[PDB]
């Protein structure tokens, strides 16, 4: 009969993953006290972790209303709203929060990364000055891929990675210690959640099946934790590799399968940014650990041994700022889907492009897209008069943000066009009607970038200082597309209207990606496979590997 104890208790199943005997424990709670803001905030957590994400937010509308105050509720009704797709109302919450607790770095983070989706800037410069101390001081759980997003060096991401890293590692216990076999084929592993219609299937996928075909005595496992969702990516790469469906097995289940099947040499290809499986890695279930593609910055932690980057992303200026040994793959550290035929998509008109005109592109993620990245782009519209600016379309009231951003620099807001959200054939096919793709910074275009060159489409960029920001630098660099590597956004600007307000330098720029798409390495997956191959075989026998 006591009150107090029963949300303490529900508490205790919550923390050791108990919703079904928590909620028993919650809804007692409910029956002394109904409507009381405690209980009805936590039941609309059961909800929550139920993955009931729509009953979450309007219990949690209730406490928050019943308790407008309460940081804690503010949060977690912000939590809900954001996973049960309500994005500007989620935005709102945060904001909230984040006044009642103005020196909350925990909230300021949240809110940050929040804005930055909604491209909402009101006082961006200050949330990211308080999100940078607070990775200085060590505080605010900031997470790496969030803060991928900030004008931070290589240093500052270090910090952050790191002291995630060991937050994470004070908690687990790794498994013994192993070795790699001295005998027999490699066994070589890939973790993931993108095995389908996602980035990290689509870009390795034609690798994959090139391994199969060219590297006999490697054995690739992959060890998908999202389930089969219908895309020919998903069926392709099972086809092509032994794929483990470990979806549903908790991190320490997961590690242990990965240690059942003995793997040699293990890959994060999740990896700061995923739903995570990082205590996977934590748990150390295979003798080599490497960081390669997924996450584009260092893992910051004491189980990497290594990242593979290549040396235009990853030149050595800033191997210092990586915790993990330093390899390189001999061209671009990116692999991608070399068989895909881009089709042909709608006329310009139902596009919504204009019928004439140079149509600029930018197809990125809200979160990339800054200040300083549109700010650049809009000059090159003011400078070339009937071009129009093409970006995908995003969440919540984006879209309104950067029209409203357009006109405030000076350009028309019709010349923004958004694509909405399209499966990936009808998506590239739209590549075929753009003229230039604009770059962003500091967070370049990655699996976009790839596309782009894929189909034909020029990428102009300014090669940064961090890994993130010289992605694109390194497509161009390795493809030999050096003049679209810039040194700052006054060439940037300058370049994009030469090319604009030139059309047959621009048609002389496309007929010149197409020979290097055909000719240089970027783009033959047999002689990645190869380099790859022999990368993990050397690296093997630097560990003990006898060879097959
Ligand atoms: C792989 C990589 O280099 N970067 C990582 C990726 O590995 C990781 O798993 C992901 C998790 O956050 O973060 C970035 C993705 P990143 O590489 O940044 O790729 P994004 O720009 O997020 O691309 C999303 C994907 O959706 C496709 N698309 C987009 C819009 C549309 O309407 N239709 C469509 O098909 C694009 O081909 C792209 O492949
Ligand atoms: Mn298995």
Request: proline content about 6%.
């Amino acid at each position: 009969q006591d009150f107090v104890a029963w949300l303490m208790l529900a508490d205790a199943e919550l923390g050791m993953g108990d919703t079904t005997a928590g909620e028993m424990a919650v809804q007692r709670g409910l029956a002394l006290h109904p409507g009381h803001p405690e209980a009805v905030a936590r039941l609309g957590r059961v909800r929550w972790t139920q993955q009931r994400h729509a009953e979450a937010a309007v219990l949690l509308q209730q406490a928050s209303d019943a308790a407008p105050e309460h940081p804690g509720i503010a949060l977690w009704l912000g939590h809900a709203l954001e996973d049960a797709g309500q994005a500007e109302a989620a935005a709102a919450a945060y904001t909230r929060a984040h006044q009642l607790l103005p020196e909350e770095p925990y909230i300021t983070a949240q809110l940050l990364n929040w804005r930055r989706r909604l491209c909402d800037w009101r006082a961006l410069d200050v949330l990211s000055a308080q999100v940078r101390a607070a990775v200085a001081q060590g505080v605010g759980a900031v997470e790496p891929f969030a803060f991928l997003s900030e004008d931070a060096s290589a240093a500052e991401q270090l910090a952050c990675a790191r002291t995630r890293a060991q937050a994470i590692a004070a908690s687990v216990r790794p498994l013994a210690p192993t070795r790699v076999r001295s005998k027999g084929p490699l066994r070589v592993g890939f973790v993931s959640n993108g095995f389908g219609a996602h980035p990290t299937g689509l870009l390795t996928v034609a690798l994959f099946e090139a391994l199969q075909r060219r590297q006999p005595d490697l054995q690739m496992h992959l060890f998908a934790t999202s389930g089969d969702d219908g895309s020919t990516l998903r069926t392709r790469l099972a086809q092509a590799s032994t794929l483990h469906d470990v979806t549903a097995l908790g991190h320490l289940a997961t590690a242990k399968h990965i240690r059942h099947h003995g793997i040699d040499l293990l890959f994060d290809l999740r990896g700061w940014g995923g739903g995570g499986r990082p205590e996977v890695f934590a748990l150390r279930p295979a003798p080599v650990q490497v960081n390669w593609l997924a996450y584009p910055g260092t893992s910051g932690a004491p189980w990497m041994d290594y990242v593979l980057g290549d040396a235009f992303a990853l030149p050595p200026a800033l191997e210092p700022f990586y915790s993990e040994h330093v390899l390189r793959l001999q061209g671009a550290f990116q692999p991608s889907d070399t068989s895909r035929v881009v089709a042909e998509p709608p006329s310009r008109t139902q596009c919504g492009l204009p019928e004439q005109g140079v149509v600029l592109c930018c197809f990125n993620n809200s979160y990339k897209l800054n200040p300083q990245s549109m700010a650049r782009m809009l000059a090159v519209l003011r400078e070339v008069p009937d071009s129009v600016l093409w970006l995908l379309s995003g969440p919540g009231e984006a879209d309104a943000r950067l029209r409203a951003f357009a006109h405030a620099q000076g350009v028309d807001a019709q010349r923004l066009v958004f694509m909405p959200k399209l499966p990936h054939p009808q998506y590239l096919a739209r590549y075929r009607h753009a003229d230039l793709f604009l770059d962003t910074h500091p967070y370049n275009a990655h699996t976009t970038a790839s596309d782009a060159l894929w189909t034909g489409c020029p990428v102009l960029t300014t090669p940064g200082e961090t890994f993130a920001a010289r992605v694109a630098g390194s497509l161009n660099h390795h493809l030999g597309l050096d003049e679209m590597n810039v040194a700052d956004d006054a060439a940037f600007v300058a370049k994009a209207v030469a090319l604009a307000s030139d059309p047959a330098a621009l048609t002389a720029l496309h007929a010149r990606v197409d020979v290097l798409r055909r000719a240089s390495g970027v783009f033959h997956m047999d002689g990645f496979a190869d380099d790859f191959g022999a990368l993990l075989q050397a690296l093997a026998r630097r560990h003990g590997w006898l060879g097959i």
